Structure 1
Amino acid sequence: GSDTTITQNQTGYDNGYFYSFRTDAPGTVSMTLHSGGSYSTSWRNTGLFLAGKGWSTGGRRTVTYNASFNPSGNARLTLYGWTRNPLVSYHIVESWGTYRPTGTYKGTVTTDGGTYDIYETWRYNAPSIEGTRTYQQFWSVRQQKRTSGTITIGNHFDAWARAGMNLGSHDYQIMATEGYQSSGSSTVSISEG
């Protein structure tokens, strides 16, 4: 056999890609780790989770992805990552379920054949890669959903910067499935280029 299914919070390297899996609802969501930059998720009556594959150190890399994205409820398909100094999480949202994410509107960026709305939000005394903190979240949210294509990450970062949304030193960067309460499944593949 060879793929691996996991159910407990962890990070690591699988098939040459970084991966992260986290939930507040153990036993309601799993991640199956496939060859290369690919994984699947399955969730049933869950809480919150985020799972994905990518890189332990993010940057401006152009990436390409393909996904099967099958939420019954609130979920997102997102190029997600973190920085430190300052502590920021960011989301380049390609598709979503019942709810389209929003925040304080800071403009648009047109890249990779689509136009994205830019938003800022804040998290308050919340989990982070640095423990309980208050920090910013940056968003690019595509104006129409899609489930495959190229993301020229640097174009997002540059648009954010023009709007005053400054990033720190990169931590991980993954093509994520995010969910809240839903049930559903996904299969996602990511690579550079």
Structure 2
Amino acid sequence: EFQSFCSSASHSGQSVKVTGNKVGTIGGVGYELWADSGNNSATFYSDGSFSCTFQNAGDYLCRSGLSFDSTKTPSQIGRMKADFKLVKQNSSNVGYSYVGVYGWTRSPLVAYYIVDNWLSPFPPGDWVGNKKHGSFTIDGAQYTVYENTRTGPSIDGDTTFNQYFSIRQQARDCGTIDISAHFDQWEKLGMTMGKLHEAKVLGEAGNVNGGASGTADFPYAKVYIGD
């Protein structure tokens, strides 16, 4: 059984269409489009919702939600949640994908993913991290938790950082991600959050061989501090 926005979601508010790599705000929501290559775009709305198009991309990320000043941990900020509705549309040669919540902390520098769905034919697998913590009940569903160490571009420049993942075992295309509940479970497993830099709804599609194309719609997406 489902929330009312799953039935009644639609894009509203002012919009911005970007086609180059860009971080910005639309109304009071923060957005970012980033891709390595291809003919890509994203349209971000002030109600939080957004739509994404990628063509011949290696790695494409469209995301919208919260941006912070990296001064406060999640517990100092308050409990956080993300409502989303994903509508998958056509795609081709999508070798990997994450859909759900993505963000960063500082001190420690960490990138984190709460993955409820994927635009690829199969969910991301064991390849996402070197440590597989196992299966956990988080926010009323089964998630596989992983941790990794990655070297590459980050919010600090090119460096190394930890990554935390929760990968949902059964895809969800509409509901509420209790972001802070994942933070709580991660802490029990020795995966500590630093000062929060962002928490955004993400659609990422890629292919290690290039050539990923498709579109995805998020007629609802809203990240908030509450409940």
For normalisation by structure 2, the TM-score amounts to 0.78
Q: Distance in 2 between matches of 1:119 and 1:112?
A: 17
- Structure 1, unaligned runs of 5 or more: none
1:124-146 CA distance string (max 9 Å, x none)? 2x000000111111000000111
> Which residue does 1:75 correspond to in 2?
97
**Structure 1 residue 99 displacement after superposition:** 4.2
Give 1 or 2 for the bigger CA radius of gyration: 2
Tell me the distance in 2 between the aligned counterparts of 1:185 and 1:78: 16
- The one-letter code sitting in structure 2 at the alignment partner of 1:108 is S
- Paired amino acid for 2:106: R
Q: 1:14 aligns with which of 26, 32, 36?
A: 26
Determine which structure has the larger strand proportion and give its number. 1
Asked if 1:133 corresponds to 2:159, the answer is: yes
Partner of 1:186: 216
- The total of aligned residue pairs comes to 190
Alpha-carbon displacement from aligned partner over 1:97-132 (angstroms, at most 9, x marks no partner): 1342232211333233311010011112x0000001
Pairwise CA RMSD of aligned residues? 1.7
- Please give the secondary structure, in 2, of the residue aligned with 1:159: helix
The share of aligned pairs that are identical, in percent, is 36
Partner of 2:191: 165
- Counterparts of 1:7-156 in structure 2, within 5 Å, are 7-25=19-37, 27-57=38-68, 59=74, 60-70=79-89, 71-72=91-92, 73=94, 74-96=96-118, 97-101=120-124, 102=126, 103=129, 104-124=131-151, 126-156=152-182
**Higher-helix-fraction structure:** 2
Q: Letter of the aligned partner of 1:147 in structure 2?
A: D
Point out 4+ residue stretches in structure 1 off by more than 4 angstroms. Answer: none
Q: Which blocks of at least 5 consecutive residues in structure 2 are unaligned? A: 1-13
1:35 shift after superposition: 3.9
- 1:72-116 CA distances to partner (integer Å, 9 max, x unpaired)? 323221200000111000000011213422322113332333110
- Cα distance in 1 between the residues matched to 2:16 and 2:194: 33
In structure 2, the CA distance between the partners of 1:160 and 1:17, relative to structure 1 (3 Å rule), is same
* Letter of the 2:62 counterpart: A
Tell me the secondary structure at the aligned position of residue 44 of structure 1: strand
3-state SS of paired residue (2:57) = coil
For the 8 Å contact 1:109–1:156, the answer to whether it is kept is no
* Aligned 8 A contact 2:39 2:55 in 1: yes
Is the contact between residue 78 and residue 178 of structure 1 (CA under 8 Å) also seen in structure 2? Answer: no
Question: Conserved in 1, the CA contact under 8 Å of 2:35 and 2:60?
Answer: yes
- Distance in 2 separating the partners of 1:37 and 1:112: 22
Equivalent position of 2:9 in the other structure: none
Specify the SS of the correspondent of 2:155: coil
Instruction: Report the 3-state secondary structure (helix = DSSP H, G, I; strand = E; otherwise coil) of the residue aligned with 1:161.
Output: helix
